[PDB]
Design an enzyme around this catalytic site. Structure first.
Site, PDB file in Angstrom:
ATOM      1  N   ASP A  36      -8.972  11.179  -6.139  1.00 27.99           N
ATOM      2  CA  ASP A  36      -8.117  11.031  -4.951  1.00 27.99           C
ATOM      3  C   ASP A  36      -7.313  12.267  -4.563  1.00 27.99           C
ATOM      4  O   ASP A  36      -6.260  12.547  -5.146  1.00 27.99           O
ATOM      5  CB  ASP A  36      -7.159   9.843  -5.158  1.00 27.99           C
ATOM      6  N   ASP A 232      -8.569  13.808   2.388  1.00 29.90           N
ATOM      7  CA  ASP A 232      -8.411  12.777   1.364  1.00 29.90           C
ATOM      8  C   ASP A 232      -9.687  12.087   0.903  1.00 29.90           C
ATOM      9  O   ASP A 232     -10.249  11.255   1.607  1.00 29.90           O
ATOM     10  CB  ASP A 232      -7.416  11.721   1.873  1.00 29.90           C
TER      11      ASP A 232
HETATM   12  C1  LIG Z   1     -13.619   7.156  -0.490  1.00 25.02           C
HETATM   13  C2  LIG Z   1     -12.792   5.983  -0.814  1.00 25.02           C
HETATM   14  C3  LIG Z   1     -11.999   5.575  -2.025  1.00 25.02           C
HETATM   15  C4  LIG Z   1     -11.404   4.370  -1.825  1.00 25.02           C
HETATM   16  C5  LIG Z   1     -10.545   3.701  -2.872  1.00 25.02           C
HETATM   17  N1  LIG Z   1     -11.728   3.868  -0.493  1.00 25.02           N
HETATM   18  C6  LIG Z   1     -11.223   2.559   0.025  1.00 25.02           C
HETATM   19  O1  LIG Z   1      -9.806   2.488   0.193  1.00 25.02           O
HETATM   20  C7  LIG Z   1      -9.210   3.275   1.147  1.00 25.02           C
HETATM   21  O2  LIG Z   1      -9.827   3.920   1.991  1.00 25.02           O
HETATM   22  N2  LIG Z   1      -7.861   3.280   1.079  1.00 25.02           N
HETATM   23  C8  LIG Z   1      -6.895   3.993   1.904  1.00 25.02           C
HETATM   24  C9  LIG Z   1      -6.278   2.978   2.904  1.00 25.02           C
HETATM   25  S1  LIG Z   1      -7.134   2.774   4.444  1.00 25.02           S
HETATM   26  C10 LIG Z   1      -8.374   1.564   4.036  1.00 25.02           C
HETATM   27  O3  LIG Z   1      -7.733   4.052   4.835  1.00 25.02           O
HETATM   28  O4  LIG Z   1      -6.184   2.231   5.383  1.00 25.02           O
HETATM   29  C11 LIG Z   1      -5.872   4.452   0.918  1.00 25.02           C
HETATM   30  O5  LIG Z   1      -4.718   4.036   0.931  1.00 25.02           O
HETATM   31  N3  LIG Z   1      -6.330   5.365  -0.016  1.00 25.02           N
HETATM   32  C12 LIG Z   1      -5.413   5.877  -1.073  1.00 25.02           C
HETATM   33  C13 LIG Z   1      -6.113   5.769  -2.470  1.00 25.02           C
HETATM   34  C14 LIG Z   1      -6.441   4.293  -2.878  1.00 25.02           C
HETATM   35  C15 LIG Z   1      -7.185   4.290  -4.225  1.00 25.02           C
HETATM   36  C16 LIG Z   1      -5.176   3.422  -3.014  1.00 25.02           C
HETATM   37  C17 LIG Z   1      -4.872   7.315  -0.834  1.00 25.02           C
HETATM   38  O6  LIG Z   1      -5.944   8.254  -0.901  1.00 25.02           O
HETATM   39  C18 LIG Z   1      -4.229   7.439   0.562  1.00 25.02           C
HETATM   40  C19 LIG Z   1      -3.089   8.460   0.549  1.00 25.02           C
HETATM   41  C20 LIG Z   1      -2.844   8.968   1.975  1.00 25.02           C
HETATM   42  C21 LIG Z   1      -1.792   7.823   0.040  1.00 25.02           C
HETATM   43  O7  LIG Z   1      -1.463   6.682   0.328  1.00 25.02           O
HETATM   44  N4  LIG Z   1      -1.017   8.635  -0.748  1.00 25.02           N
HETATM   45  C22 LIG Z   1       0.270   8.148  -1.279  1.00 25.02           C
HETATM   46  C23 LIG Z   1       1.257   8.089  -0.072  1.00 25.02           C
HETATM   47  O8  LIG Z   1       1.173   8.879   0.842  1.00 25.02           O
HETATM   48  N5  LIG Z   1       2.213   7.082  -0.135  1.00 25.02           N
HETATM   49  C24 LIG Z   1       3.235   6.890   0.922  1.00 25.02           C
HETATM   50  C25 LIG Z   1       2.985   5.596   1.764  1.00 25.02           C
HETATM   51  C26 LIG Z   1       1.689   5.703   2.573  1.00 25.02           C
HETATM   52  C27 LIG Z   1       2.889   4.376   0.852  1.00 25.02           C
HETATM   53  C28 LIG Z   1       0.782   9.016  -2.459  1.00 25.02           C
HETATM   54  C29 LIG Z   1       1.160  10.417  -1.983  1.00 25.02           C
HETATM   55  C30 LIG Z   1       2.005   8.363  -3.138  1.00 25.02           C
HETATM   56  N6  LIG Z   1     -12.557   4.771   0.184  1.00 25.02           N
END
Ligand SMILES: Cc1cc(C)n(COC(=O)N[C@@H](CS(C)(=O)=O)C(=O)N[C@@H](CC(C)C)[C@@H](O)C[C@@H](C)C(=O)N[C@H](C(=O)NCC(C)C)C(C)C)n1
EC number: 3.4.23.46
Length: 389
Positions: A36, A232
């Site tokens: 990730d 990402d």
């Molecule tokens: C290739 C691949 C891998 C996986 C596991 N997928 C399916 O899941 C997703 O695509 N998940 C996305 C959400 S979606 C379906 O676009 O709306 C997702 O949230 N991916 C995250 C990883 C998974 C395993 C939970 C991360 O790659 C997204 C990243 C921008 C993130 O949320 N980072 C966090 C963040 O920014 N948090 C703040 C807010 C958003 C809670 C960290 C920095 C703490 N596709």
């Protein structure tokens, strides 16, 4: 230039995730870890869960160190809580090293683990700045570089099959490569073009122009990075800021108007199916993202095909139909270049030189008439103005 030992070390696919095998603890406990680039915490399931076939057992590791501190990590979708500690970690099909790294032992989670994905943890490869609880928790790659002689960079080739894969097929196939500490020339064709990492937190980049079949979306370029634009490997779709998403979908619908699809399709929720082998790829436009180059006033472009943004999914009916979901969706947190973009290119995360390289992937899906592309240079001015503050 050649790391045969690490080529083809990834498994998985879009939707569920691409993962690499790692071992943690002493004796080594084997676990599949999701790659990730969108986060910075190394974490692993550490207690039974319906979707986990195995998990980290701290009590069985002689090298486990308890930091006596909890941690919470929320993602765009999904979240988990765990207990911080450290332990020795190795990567079987990676460099021959062992590093002591921070590990979050996941004890509670929600919408995080994915049934059938075959992965039990996540390797956040981004920078300390976005690590939880704070930037004091050194990310895994930082530990790796500090404790070994592995160069400060890695590269990813995520390979989409271009058709649905069943459980046994995803398990028995190569999902791609993560070359740690270098670049392997067999994974791409043509040349590598680099864009600056704007800031070291997420792998942030700057998009300066967007085209649908060569036609300029013609928006104020700040809109393209409104809030931010990141690369990402943990996101499946190409996610775009609301305003850009709307403009892009309007243009894509116009280019493919010889066929009409339900709103649910454009919302990325429902599939569209065609008789086996008859997908009208040619009616869908290519999408080009122009990125800031390393040379002043210079930019290059990456171009994907519908074979990248129309994600293959199995049709319920025993039909031999070829079905897909529209893999472009709206975002309220900036542009996310997910697997839709990454499966089209070999991506070099050159942390040492603060830049991200793109080259046409040796495993991208296409047809006899078009291929994904990375081309340049283009004389582009005031790109710095495309960044959002
Ligand atoms: C290739 C691949 C891998 C996986 C596991 N997928 C399916 O899941 C997703 O695509 N998940 C996305 C959400 S979606 C379906 O676009 O709306 C997702 O949230 N991916 C995250 C990883 C998974 C395993 C939970 C991360 O790659 C997204 C990243 C921008 C993130 O949320 N980072 C966090 C963040 O920014 N948090 C703040 C807010 C958003 C809670 C960290 C920095 C703490 N596709």
């Amino acid at each position: 230039g050649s790391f045969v030992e690490m080529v083809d070390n990834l498994r998985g696919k879009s939707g569920q995730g691409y993962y690499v095998e790692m071992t943690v603890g002493s004796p080594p406990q084997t676990l599949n870890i999701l790659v990730d680039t969108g986060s910075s915490n190394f974490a692993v399931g550490a207690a039974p869960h319906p979707f986990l076939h195995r998990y980290y057992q701290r009590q069985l590791s002689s090298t486990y160190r308890d930091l006596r501190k909890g941690v919470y990590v929320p993602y765009t979708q999904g979240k988990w809580e765990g207990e911080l500690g450290t332990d020795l970690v190795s990567i079987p099909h990676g460099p021959n090293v062992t590093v002591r790294a921070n590990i979050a032992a996941i004890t509670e989670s929600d919408k995080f683990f994915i049934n059938g994905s075959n992965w039990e943890g996540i390797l956040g490869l981004a920078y300390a700045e976005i690590a939880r609880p704070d930037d004091s928790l050194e990310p895994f790659f930082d530990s790796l570089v500090k404790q070994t002689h592995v160069p400060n960079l890695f590269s990813l080739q995520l390979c989409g099959a271009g058709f649905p894969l069943n459980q046994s097929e995803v398990l028995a196939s190569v999902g791609g490569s993560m070359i740690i500490g270098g670049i392997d020339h067999s994974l791409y064709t043509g040349s590598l073009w680099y864009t600056p990492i704007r800031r070291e937190w997420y792998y942030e980049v700057i998009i300066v122009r967007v085209e649908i079949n060569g036609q300029d979306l013609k928006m104020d370029c700040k809109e393209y990075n409104y809030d931010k634009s990141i690369v990402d490997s943990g996101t499946t779709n190409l996610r775009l800021p609301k305003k850009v998403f709307e403009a892009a979908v309007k243009s894509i619908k116009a280019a493919s108007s010889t066929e009409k699809f339900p709103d649910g399709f454009w919302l990325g929720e429902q599939l569209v199916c065609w008789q086996a082998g008859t997908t009208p790829w040619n009616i869908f436009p290519v999408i080009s993202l122009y990125l800031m180059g390393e040379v002043t006033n210079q930019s290059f472009r990456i171009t994907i095909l519908p074979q990248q943004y129309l994600r293959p999914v199995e049709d319920v009916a025993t039909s031999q139909d070829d079905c897909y979901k529209f893999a472009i969706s709206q975002s309220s947190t900036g542009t996310v270049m997910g697997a839709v973009i990454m499966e089209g290119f070999y991506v070099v995360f050159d942390r040492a030189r603060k830049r991200i390289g793109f080259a046409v992937s040796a495993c991208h899906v296409h047809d006899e008439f078009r291929t994904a592309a990375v081309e340049g240079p283009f004389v582009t001015l005031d790109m710095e103005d495309c960044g959002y503050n």
